Amino acid sequence: PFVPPSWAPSVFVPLTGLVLPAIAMATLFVYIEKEAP
Amino acid sequence: WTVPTLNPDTPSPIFGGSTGGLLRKAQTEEFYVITWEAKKEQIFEMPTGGAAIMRQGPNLLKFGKKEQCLALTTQLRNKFKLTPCFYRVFPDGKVQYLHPADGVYPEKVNAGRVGANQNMRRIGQNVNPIKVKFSGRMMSPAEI
Amino acid sequence: GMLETPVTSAPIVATYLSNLPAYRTGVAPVLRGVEIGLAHGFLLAGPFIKLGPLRNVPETAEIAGSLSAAGLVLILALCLSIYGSAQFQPLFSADGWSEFAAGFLVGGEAGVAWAYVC
Amino acid sequence: WYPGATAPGDYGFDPLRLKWFREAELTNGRWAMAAVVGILFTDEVAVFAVLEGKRYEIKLKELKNGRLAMLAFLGFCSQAAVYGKGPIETLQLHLADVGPETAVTVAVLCVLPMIIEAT
Amino acid sequence: AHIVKIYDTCIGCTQCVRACPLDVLEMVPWDGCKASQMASAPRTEDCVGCKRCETACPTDFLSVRVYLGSESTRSMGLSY
Amino acid sequence: HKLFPKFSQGLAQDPTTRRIWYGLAMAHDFESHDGMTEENLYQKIFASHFGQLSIIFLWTSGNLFHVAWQGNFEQWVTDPVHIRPIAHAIWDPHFGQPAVEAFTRGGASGPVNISTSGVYQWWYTIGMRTNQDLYVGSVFLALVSAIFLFAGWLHLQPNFQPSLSWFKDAESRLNHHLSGLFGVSSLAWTGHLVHVAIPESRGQHVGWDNFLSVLPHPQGLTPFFTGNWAAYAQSPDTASHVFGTAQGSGQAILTFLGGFHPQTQSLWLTDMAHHHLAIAVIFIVAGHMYRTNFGIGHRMQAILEAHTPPSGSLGAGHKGLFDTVNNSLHFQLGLALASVGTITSLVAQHMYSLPPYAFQAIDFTTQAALYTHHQYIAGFIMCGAFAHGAIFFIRDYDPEQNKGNVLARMLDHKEALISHLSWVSLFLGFHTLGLYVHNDVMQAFGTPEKQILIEPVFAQWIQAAHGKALYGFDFLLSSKTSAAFANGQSLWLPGWLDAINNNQNSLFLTIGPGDFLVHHAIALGLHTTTLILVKGALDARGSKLMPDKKDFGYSFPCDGPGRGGTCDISAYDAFYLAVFWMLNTIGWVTFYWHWKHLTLWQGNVAQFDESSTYLMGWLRDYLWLNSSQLINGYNPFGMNSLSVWAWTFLFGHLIYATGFMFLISWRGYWQELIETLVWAHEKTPLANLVYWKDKPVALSIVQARLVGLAHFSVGYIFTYAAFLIASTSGRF
């Protein structure tokens, strides 16, 4: 019970290619530009 | 000698307007205002680029950083034998006089100045960087 | 002093800049966003259709170009939102810029959908 | 929410570290309750934008049923994408007589309430 | 701010003071040298770290030293 | 001000874009954070080490999973001579149908990459036969990675943070790491070899189902407890053994044969078992040396205080070195990097020549890729060893604790050291370049019989001492009437002699005047890189141009234009200048390796022996000739499977060239350009409604050197990787 299905690159490659870089760069940008109290 | 005051209603030198003047730093953070009194009408060189005519009497320019006012001070002091003073102005309106902060120019000794940042030893008499490891920050051995 | 040029100090230039929707000073940030989005999505739908990778297949070039235009409008709205989250901590406020970014999202998707409905 | 747990329909569960988040929890819960009712009872642009804009420009049982329905909708999507059957068919195969992840996840989860106590 | 230090090998030649483009240094009364003058750095918050003072100092080794430190808007020489 | 970075408020009060880069760059330099003590230093380093372990095991589990799902391992093991090893499948929606057809090679459904990492050979030799086995291994190593990441998080917790005494305990750590981490791990790998990897090569499956009911030897443990240990060497594998099957097999589990298995052209599993067993016993015995809490044992400070010679020829000797190795992490890190870099060179040099894995050295692209991969890794690690040694001199070195010892006396004769390194570098450079230019003038003027061809008689003497009967010296292993020959002749020499007298492998290749000239160029590169690195380490405290260099730290830009100007005066900048010589030197050794092996693999070693003696022969017959199918990877007639390597070849040339921009042009030009950009943005209407939060400035001097060296190095690596993989795979 190990083999991931036949549709798996079509989701996982654009996920870590586009969605997680967008979320990660937005999150790191908001963390960089945050003011200290 | 007493600390002089900035007159904002001082006429400026004759100048057609450069692209190298003030920016949003003058509106948000600070800008500096230089003031001198001339003996005659005479052309000088603007530190931001270009030529300008100083008036006969009180003059007034405003610059972004401090080195621009030092460059114009050195020019007006070594070329025209003038005595300028430039201030620090904030968008609040707070006006901070300096140079000459004692009233006497810093290139000659004046009684009353307190010596700051004077290590009373040679540079070879500093400690090793092992002796200043694990303080609250990066330190150089010449700081102590 | 500042340099004088017809380009920076013309009255027709001043009236045109005061009439563009980023300047009116009294209209809502939602309205500014939807007008700017209706402009920019409608112009952005074009080159994806005409030069995209599916440009030579009939009936699907316009669909793929408008879909990529909608994706780029979504990316731009995310950029506006994170710019507001970084910059502000009526248009130049946190709530106002969030309203403006949501208006840009809505107006940009409407502009792409109207550039298709063509 | 566990025996011995401490705080940082609230129960003190915040492992990742507010009012916008509470409102988002309430609206994800409401739409998930409507979606779970629709999936159990299973077997336009500008007006929606105006209603959403009016909603944006504007009590324990609601978020209790909301969290239960969010877990239910995750259940529908998960055991539909894995089993390939509907909820009634998966329930019928469950009754009357990803596995490593489920087992690993449960044990790991338990190791987890234990670990917090340790630290 | 940059760390500017003056050491007791100073001979009060005033060369560093007339080399600084920022008015950071000044001459104070002293008794350690024949000139009865010593340099001092009371305004290191405006120091950019150009090291014209170090270039101007005649002593071997230097009597003025500039240790580049944490940057601000004044020490980076920004006009914007 | 701003929050990032949390470890430095001096950087957090920076209003520019310098803050982001310097927060990225000073993040893992824990000795210079705010409020850092020594216990906190060691604890965060311990947690980071756990993080490194978790990333390595996740990397290995990912390699296993992607092979097990998208490769052809079970099909490769049936005929590993004619089938190419698949790395992972390709999903690129930017492709076209010719590219999908081109990267769909076989036997695969869609587009694949063909692996050049040797993992199929390694996994097949250690006993993998099926995909499920690789799935179980991937799940196991992912669970191990999760355990190490959790253990880093756990040992950060305040009920689990170790004290400073636990980190500064050297005798316990050497006893546990020698006896357990080396010895017991090597013993357990011997157990894996004997129990699994040898019967899998005999054709018998020994998995977890039956490893308790299958005998490793037909008399188990009775020779081991009788002392009759030679009963495990009886009946070895025959010289007609088909690997992985039962035809031509034996019963032995621990032989000592020498040379190679005849089919696979690789080391014997029984010899590797015996090898790991012997070194396991030696490391377990060596792990009982130092004094823990049991009375017996050696005391390292006592050993160091004792080894001071008479007559004061080393002064105080090794006095006070224990408190300077123990208290400094940069000394320990430099020692570790020097050892691991030399061992990585050892791995590459011994794995091309003595290939361990079945059907390695018939996969020529795997041979070239693994050699070049560990040689460049070794070069970077050696440069880091010298870098952290210079950091040791600046930060950790106390001179009063070392008054008179070996470390102070090196600083005393640093000028003699740098002078004699300068001499050997100049000598090797003048005469190596002069001989190559001389032979080029001879080859240009049509007279090859005038060119200076010195014969490598010393290394040929050494090969004759090793048992190679080509050069006719005939002594010590090449003469049949020798004591060493006659004593080793009964047991391990008959395989070693056949393997060293075979001229169809990399075991002690035939050498000539080209090999002479290139080994001299290699010595030039080594001595020169050592010159820059030793000069940067020993002039790190200061020089006559700057006596107080220790007061500025390790990586400062310069000391200004005074005193004639002082550019690249820092020890970091000496490292920076030496990375170029590292890349040059490894480029020389891998050009040499690759061209001598391409001429071995094609069949005409005469081509290398003739053209290797002149640099036009280099440029014509290696670089111009072997890049004919590379640059034809795509063309206006079509494309094929080498188009990714042609694109990556041009990609590396581009990154190299972009690095030259940061290397040549310096800061103030770009600062003036950015100031005009700031003016333009603040004056442009309807774009000055958008304003930066961080003030844009040009990159600093040190950052510029780092970014230029980074682009330079990445382009260097990608260009030679694309050329080597594409030439070897396209022509074989």
Ligand code: CLA
């Ligand atoms: C860590 C080593 C590693 C590397 C370099 C790769 C590389 C790849 N994977 Mg694989 N993956 C791995 C481990 C790895 N994998 C493991 C151990 C599993 C089993 C859980 C998978 C399950 C998997 C699937 C189902 C698929 C891929 C696919 C791919 C390809 C496309 C990238 C992608 O979207 O994957 C996504 C990556 C994952 C799903 C696993 C990552 C999970 C770990 C815990 C994340 C680690 C993050 C890392 C430490 C830091 C990165 C973030 C940081 C830089 C900010 C690429 C060749 C796709 C493919 O085959 O294309 C043809 C694809 O469909 N991977």
Ligand code: CLA
């Ligand atoms: C690594 C991740 C990644 C992935 C999976 C893709 C995938 C794609 N790119 Mg590529 N691209 C990438 C990175 C990636 N890109 C990068 C880093 C660059 C710069 C070097 C490019 C530069 C580039 C260009 C110039 C073009 C593409 C195009 C494409 C499309 C291929 C052409 C086609 O036949 O589709 C058919 C295309 C469609 C059916 C329409 C595409 C619209 C998508 C599906 C919208 C996605 C919806 C989503 C909500 C958008 C926001 C996502 C965001 C929140 C993360 C395909 C979707 C082409 C394209 O965009 O086609 C229009 C194209 O012209 N790419």
Ligand code: CLA
């Ligand atoms: C038009 C340009 C273009 C683009 C955008 C792509 C995109 C891709 N190629 Mg394709 N390809 C192209 C042209 C392109 N290709 C060309 C011209 C060729 C030669 C013919 C190929 C030949 C080719 C092959 C042989 C393969 C690909 C593969 C891929 C996919 C990699 C998936 C991935 O791992 O994403 C994530 C990207 C990475 C992991 C690499 C980026 C590394 C980062 C930037 C390092 C720095 C990290 C740093 C910390 C920043 C982190 C950011 C943080 C915020 C998260 C991706 C979709 C691979 C594939 O299909 O796998 C599924 C694959 O095997 N391509």
Ligand code: CLA
């Ligand atoms: C720094 C970057 C780097 C990278 C990316 C590589 C990459 C590689 N190395 Mg190289 N290597 C490197 C540096 C590097 N190396 C250095 C610095 C050295 C000198 C130390 C080596 C020495 C070396 C050797 C000798 C070999 C490789 C091999 C390889 C290849 C196989 C992948 C692998 O290593 O499996 C991942 C490995 C592991 C996850 C660990 C293996 C198991 C360890 C050794 C022992 C486990 C003990 C166990 C846990 C104890 C249980 C006890 C019991 C009682 C319970 C891969 C190309 C192999 C190869 O070339 O194959 C074709 C190979 O044989 N490397």
Ligand code: CLA
């Ligand atoms: C006997 C029990 C024991 C064991 C097994 C370990 C094991 C370890 N400790 Mg140690 N430790 C111990 C007792 C032990 N420790 C004690 C008693 C103390 C207190 C005195 C410590 C104090 C301590 C500290 C402070 C640290 C460690 C660390 C480590 C890790 C070293 C890094 C590493 O993984 O490389 C493994 C090394 C090898 C596998 C040997 C390499 C041999 C050569 C170079 C490679 C060539 C072999 C072979 C040819 C390669 C084949 C390649 C393959 C792909 C084919 C390792 C897991 C470090 C760590 O990482 O923490 C997380 C660390 O910082 N320990």
Ligand code: CLA
């Ligand atoms: C055992 C391994 C090891 C460990 C634990 C350390 C630890 C340390 N090193 Mg050392 N060092 C090592 C090996 C190690 N190093 C090696 C192998 C080298 C040679 C490269 C060095 C050379 C070196 C230098 C010159 C310096 C250090 C410094 C440091 C300290 C701070 C690290 C930091 O903050 O930089 C953060 C790390 C970065 C910002 C990395 C930037 C990325 C680099 C440039 C590579 C970019 C290539 C890119 C990834 C490729 C992408 C390709 C694309 C197509 C995808 C820390 C004590 C510094 C120090 O002590 O200051 C006083 C320092 O100046 N190290």
Ligand code: CLA
């Ligand atoms: C082909 C390019 C090239 C060459 C030939 C050299 C040569 C040298 N480098 Mg340099 N270097 C280079 C590129 C090069 N480097 C690059 C790209 C970098 C990165 C910045 C460096 C950084 C660097 C550092 C940090 C160091 C060197 C050092 C050296 C010298 C080492 C000792 C030696 O072998 O000298 C042998 C002499 C030669 C190779 C010069 C040839 C002499 C000619 C042929 C004699 C005159 C011929 C003819 C009459 C000329 C007439 C012309 C007429 C107009 C006058 C050597 C002169 C080291 C050094 O200077 O030690 C003393 C040193 O420490 N280099």
Ligand SMILES: CC1=C(/C=C/C(C)=C/C=C/C(C)=C/C=C/C=C(C)/C=C/C=C(C)/C=C/C2=C(C)CCCC2(C)C)C(C)(C)CCC1
């Ligand atoms: C800077 C510095 C540093 C570093 C250093 C380094 C980096 C080094 C390296 C080093 C090295 C890297 C070395 C090497 C060595 C080697 C050797 C020493 C070898 C030897 C060998 C032998 C002896 C062998 C022999 C033999 C043969 C040849 C054959 C037969 C067999 C036999 C075995 C007999 C430190 C940290 C300390 C700190 C201080 C500073």
Ligand code: SF4
């Ligand atoms: S560095 Fe520039 S500013 Fe600082 S003292 Fe020397 S001259 Fe004056």
